[PDB]
Structures are given as structure tokens and as C-alpha cells.
Design a protein around this nucleic acid. Structure first.
Lengths: 220, 107, 62, 127, 50
RNA sequence: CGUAAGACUAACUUAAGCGAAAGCAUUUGCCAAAGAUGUUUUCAUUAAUCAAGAACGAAAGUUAGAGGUUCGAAGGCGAUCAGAUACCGCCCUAGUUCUAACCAUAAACGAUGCCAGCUAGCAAUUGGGUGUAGCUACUUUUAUGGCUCUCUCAGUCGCUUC
């Protein structure tokens, strides 16, 4: 017994999404939700919103050179017309991952799991390559498949020292610097001279609790 | 008679090797007996690019590229003219030529 | 509508001989945005046509 | 002054879905695809149907007033063609010429880590 | 059996004579054969429910 | 945005590698085995090849369970066509999947049996060894790692003509 008349956008209120105290700027963009009712509350048709946004759009480089690093935010709470959009992961753009795979080199992966001091059980994807040291006219520079398993050992122990690392206010600030990618690089060059290391994916498969006492210093 | 010393390609020290699927044909032809095209393409033709860089808010926004690999049936790559009917002395040439142009197949 | 259209080059008779000799049309307000049309009709340099649609590009130049 | 949409161009063969949404994609504006404009079953692929039915969305996103937006090209590859069709970015020159501020262009077709089995059967598409 | 002792019993030739799928609330001593059967025949298909 | 299920392991992927052959690709652990290189180790002809006989043997097919997404012979429809039990298009069944058995065939091909000696160029690479203060990452240079050319084994590819 609804029978909406005409222009259902007329009953739709615009809500501007926000950002936490993680790095920088607050407002990111606006979304639009239906009007509140006793069956269709606007405050709970809205916390299942995952919001997709880059990082160089949010670290505010006017010349965006970190523009290959999307990281999603999950809308979590509705407050003061502007939803809060807590952290949901750290992806990476399609045409940066797909643009680094030219054959003649070695892809090494490390799909690792660890959780912080607070139980955001996140899964990290350390992706590297091998680099032809110049003066070599060979076209391959391929690894030794136990050289691969020795650095894949080394990529899984440092980032599981970083992740158990005073929950995301430290951790996303590390990948906003790529501070693991400058220490996953200089450590493994005792094993092999490694190419561009891209962390490429973070899922946040588990979320501990809502509990806004831990959100007010994170958003305020 | 044996028309090629390769036969298809690369079947040495394997016995038998995995097949992939054709693109236009959707066959099931070997991975090594396959016309492969690692196609890199600009998304926006590079002739309507000035229409898009007008609307770019940022530093003219250098454009991403399209990446794919075109596994081809042999009878459906001759048909789409990736390869054609070489001469019996030109049959033997593999690496030449690149040697054509600037970036092809985009256009 | 009567949107201006000056020419740059006349080509081979594509369109499988409708003598559809294509062209790279130049406009007035700019000199760089201007781009291909595939016209019908014999063209000398300096044909100041006026075209309806400035959105068709017909990207099969030969 | 930056409000953002997402165009979601599903640039398939024999259709084109110019279906802009809000930023999270749960809320859709102006569902216009290339099929709802011409009806002859075989010019739905054409770049002219992607020409007019892309800036056909550009008026109806100005009913709510979203200046800037993002693009998401889709191919439609799963176990399938994995590259956008004919009327792919003719629906991109349609948008930027129609007074829009377009910065983000991304190929968000996803690609499998290997396909289940595709249609056709080992010698597929004879004739 | 004989037509006294069963719905299916009875004929000269030995047959059910009427449908063996009966309604749910058909209420004994009629509820014989297939009790409220959603479908019959051999399954040619995969309907494990997982 | 999800939850769930079964499959398949892309791109990296090569004129690379392993394996008796059929075959083999997500990490990680554990298990047993293999070539090769190295070796002023050990034994001392133990080796070569093979009727009969044994072990393995793609796919399909068969049994008996567990599964049952995708695909899909058969079947059922729609076109095309003079005809169309076909090609093309739709839902699909046996099958593909896993287990425990059977079967023993493939263009199972390099249409080329195995061990052995000889006979040539040229370039690449897989693996191991050894001189390059050749470079080179930095605990300080060194120890290593990466490559560089220079050798060297077993080769495998490639091309040129006896």
C-alpha cells in the first residue's frame, strides 16, 4: 500500500560522507537516502554503504601521483546529516596491477593474515616483481623458486610484525606512507634485488565491535 | 609431409601441454599452438582524448590503458588476419619484424 | 544545425565506392579539437561546409 | 564544489548500460541504457546509441545537480570477451561534451583466476 | 489384495487404477500410495540441497 | 553490499622445467623418491637388450557410494534451408567432480625403440662446479646476493651448411 506518485527523488535527502581522524580532510562526497518512516528508517538503510574513493584524492596532492591506491570506507553511523564512513580496506586500482605484469620477470605473492591489538582481522597481499639489473643483456632475470620461497618467508614475518601494531591509526598511516613497502624492499635485497612492491589489497574480513567510545577519538 | 619442424610450437620435453580457449571462436586449442596477442590499448582512442582532458579536474589526468591477451584459434586468426598464408621461405621467420610503425591496433 | 565546417584533406573513395571521400573537418572557434567526418561528395580545399552533427566521428579512416 | 557520481558504463556487445549511481552504488539515478532508445535489435551495439543515451543521463543527473562523476567501464568479461564493445567510449565523449567534469576512468571488469567452463564445446562456434 | 482391504486392490488385471499420489488431508483408510507427493518419477537431476 | 556452494587455478607462462610414459601450476606443513653436479668415497664387472610375465597408462565408457556450479553427447523446442535428425540459439540429462574399484585404448607422434663410440659450426638457456677486488646490496668494505664476461659438465633448443 505504498504507490509512490511521481519523482521519488523528491523524498530523498542528501547525506555527505565523512572521514576519520586518520590522515587529513573530512568531507569526501554526498549520497542520497530516502525519507524516514516507521518501517523504512533512513538511519538503517545507510550503514550497509561501502564507499569507494582513492587516496591521492584524500591526501590532497593537487598533482595526484598516488592515484593508483583506492581504499574503501564502510558507512557505519549516521550523525548530524553526515555519515561517518569508517575503514573497510585498502585496495589498489585495476590499471596499476594489470600494468605491471610484463612477462620476463618473477611475480612473488604473499597473501597473509594477521589481526591488530583490536580484532580487525585483515588479510594483506604483498605483491612484488624482479628487476633486470642493467649491464645484463639477458631478457629474463627470473628467480630460483626457492629464492621465491625465501623472500615470501621474509614478506610474511615483517608485515605480521607491523599488523600486530597498535590498531589502524598506526597501520593505515603506514600504508599511507607505504612504510612497509620501503622496508619490505631493503630487507629482501640480501636475497634478491626486488622491483616495485605493491600491497595491492587489504580485506577487513572481521570487525570487532561497533562501540563508539573507540570512535570518538577516531572521529572528532 | 612434415610442414614445420615445430609442428605447433614448443612441444619438447612435455609430452602434452594445457589448452586455452579461443576468443572469437571459443575453441580449446593448446597454449603453445596459439596465436597470442598481448593487446595494450588506450581506453579513449587518443583522438577523442581532448574532449576528456577538458573535463579532467586534475593535471590533465594521464589516461589508463586497457590490457588483455587474445588467445586465438589458428583457423580464427587467419580469418581475422592476425596471421596470413606466408611464403615457404618467409614461413621460417619468427622474430622479425617489429619494424612497422608507431602504436598499431588502437588506432 | 548550420554548424560550420571547413576541410583539410580529401581521401580515397571509401565506403566501397559510394565515392564517400572522407575528410578531417576544421571548425572556426578552435583549431585543435577538430576531427574526422566521412562525407559524400568531391571536395577541394576551402570547401566551407556547414554540418548538422558534430558528435559523429566515423573512425574508420583509410 | 565537488559532488561525485559513478557512471557505470557496462559497455557490452549488443547493448550499453549508462547507469549512473551515487558514490556507493546502492542508489541509482537515471537507469538509461542504449536499448530503451532505438528498437531494431542490431543497432543497440552502435556507438550512436551510446552517443545519445549517455548524455540522456546528463540531464537527469542535473535534476539532482551532481557536477563531477567517475567512470566504470565493463567489458563484459567473466569467462567472456574481457574488452569493451563498439559503443564503449563514444559514451565518454558524449558525457564530457555535455558539460560534465570527468575525472576517474577505470576498467572494472573483473577477471577470473580461471574460468569454470565457457559456452561452445572444444570446437566452438562453427560457422 | 481385494477391493475390500485396500484402495489399490481389486481388478482382474493387477493395477492401481487411479492416481497413487493422494492428498495430504485425505484421512485414513484412504491415505495409501504416495502421501502428498510433490513430484514423482525418477530424478534426472542434481537436487542435493546445499 | 552480502551469505552459501561446487568447479577451475588465469595474468606471471617461456621454444623454461620435472616425470618411465600417460601427465604435472593458489600458498604452507609433513612424507617418501629422482636426475645432475661435485667427490686422490665404497664395492669390483655386479653391466646391455629383451619372448613369457609384471607395474603404470589421456579421454571416453562401466560398477558402488558422495556430490552436483559451469559446461554438456542424448532428448525437447526456435530458426535457416527445396530438405536439416546438422552448423547457430535456449533450459537442460548421462557425464565433468571426489572416493573405492574395473577397463587398457589415443595422431599414447618426434608417425623417428634402448645402451655404446665417433663426426661442426653458431647463438641462447635449465642445473651444478670453479678463477674474474668484473661489478656490486650494505653490518664497514669484506662474509652474501644480483648480474658481467671467462671457463666447465649433462644436455635441450635454435639457426648455417657437410
Amino acid at each position: 500500500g505504498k504507490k509512490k506518485v511521481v519523482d521519488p527523488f523528491s523524498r530523498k535527502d542528501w547525506y555527505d560522507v565523512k572521514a576519520p581522524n586518520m590522515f587529513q580532510t573530512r568531507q569526501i562526497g554526498k549520497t542520497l537516502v530516502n525519507r524516514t518512516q516507521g518501517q523504512r528508517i533512513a538511519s538503517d538503510y545507510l550503514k550497509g554503504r561501502v564507499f569507494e574513493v582513492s587516496l591521492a584524492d584524500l591526501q590532497k596532492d593537487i598533482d595526484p601521483e598516488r592515484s593508483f591506491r583506492k581504499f574503501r570506507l564502510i558507512a557505519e553511523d549516521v550523525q548530524d546529516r553526515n555519515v561517518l564512513c569508517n575503514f573497510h580496506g585498502m585496495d589498489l586500482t585495476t590499471d596499476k596491477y594489470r600494468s605491471m605484469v610484463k612477462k620476463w620477470q618473477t611475480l612473488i605473492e604473499a597473501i597473509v593474515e594477521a589481526k591488530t591489538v583490536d580484532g580487525y582481522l585483515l588479510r594483506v597481499f604483498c605483491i612484488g616483481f624482479t628487476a633486470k639489473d642493467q649491464q645484463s643483456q639477458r631478457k629474463t632475470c627470473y628467480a630460483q623458486q626457492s629464492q621465491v620461497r625465501k623472500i615470501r618467508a621474509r614478506m610474511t614475518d615483517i608485515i605480521t610484525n607491523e599488523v600486530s601494531g597498535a590498531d589502524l591509526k598506526q597501520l593505515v598511516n603506514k600504508l599511507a606512507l607505504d612504510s612497509i613497502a620501503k622496508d619490505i624492499e631493503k630487507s629482501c635485497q640480501r636475497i634478491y634485488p626486488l622491483h616495485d612492491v605493491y600491497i595491492r589489497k587489504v580485506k577487513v574480513l572481521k570487525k570487532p565491535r561497533f562501540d563508539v567510545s573507540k570512535l570518538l577519538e577516531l572521529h572528532g | 609431409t612434415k610442414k614445420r619442424r615445430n609442428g605447433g610450437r614448443n612441444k619438447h620435453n612435455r609430452g602434452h601441454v594445457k589448452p586455452v580457449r579461443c576468443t572469437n571462436c571459443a575453441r580449446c586449442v593448446p597454449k603453445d599452438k596459439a596465436i597470442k596477442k598481448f593487446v595494450i590499448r588506450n581506453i579513449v582512442e587518443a583522438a577523442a582524448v581532448r574532449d576528456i582532458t577538458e573535463a579532467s579536474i586534475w593535471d590533465s589526468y594521464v589516461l589508463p590503458k586497457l590490457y588483455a591477451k587474445l588467445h586465438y584459434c589458428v583457423s580464427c586468426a587467419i580469418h581475422s588476419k592476425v596471421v596470413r598464408n606466408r611464403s615457404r621461405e618467409a614461413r621460417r621467420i619468427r622474430t622479425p619484424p617489429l619494424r612497422s610503425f608507431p602504436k598499431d591496433m588502437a588506432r | 544545425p548550420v554548424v560550420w565546417a571547413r576541410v583539410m584533406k580529401v581521401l580515397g573513395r571509401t565506403g566501397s565506392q559510394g565515392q564517400c571521400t572522407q575528410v578531417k573537418v576544421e571548425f572556426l572557434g578552435e583549431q585543435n579539437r577538430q576531427i574526422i567526418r566521412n562525407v559524400k561528395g568531391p571536395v577541394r580545399e576551402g570547401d566551407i561546409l556547414t554540418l548538422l552533427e558534430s558528435e559523429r566521428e566515423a573512425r574508420r579512416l583509410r | 564544489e565537488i559532488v561525485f557520481g559513478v557512471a557505470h558504463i557496462y559497455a557490452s556487445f549488443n547493448d550499453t548500460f549508462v547507469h549512473v549511481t551515487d558514490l556507493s552504488g546502492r542508489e541509482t539515478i537515471a537507469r538509461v541504457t542504449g536499448g530503451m532508445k532505438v528498437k531494431a535489435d542490431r543497432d543497440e551495439a552502435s556507438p550512436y546509441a551510446a552517443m545519445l543515451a549517455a548524455q540522456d543521463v546528463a540531464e537527469k543527473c542535473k535534476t539532482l545537480g551532481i557536477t563531477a562523476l567517475h567512470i566504470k567501464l565493463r567489458a563484459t568479461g567473466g569467462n567472456k570477451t574481457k574488452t569493451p564493445g563498439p559503443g564503449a567510449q563514444s559514451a565518454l565523449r558524449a558525457l564530457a561534451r555535455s558539460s560534465m567534469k570527468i575525472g576517474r576512468i577505470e576498467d572494472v571488469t573483473p577477471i577470473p583466476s580461471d574460468s569454470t567452463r565457457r559456452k561452445g564445446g572444444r570446437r566452438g562456434r562453427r560457422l | 489384495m481385494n477391493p475390500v482391504e485396500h484402495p489399490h486392490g481389486g481388478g482382474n488385471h493387477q493395477h492401481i487404477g487411479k492416481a497413487s499420489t493422494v492428498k495430504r488431508g485425505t484421512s485414513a483408510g484412504r491415505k495409501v500410495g504416495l502421501i502428498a507427493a510433490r513430484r514423482t518419477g525418477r530424478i534426472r537431476g542434481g537436487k542435493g540441497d546445499s
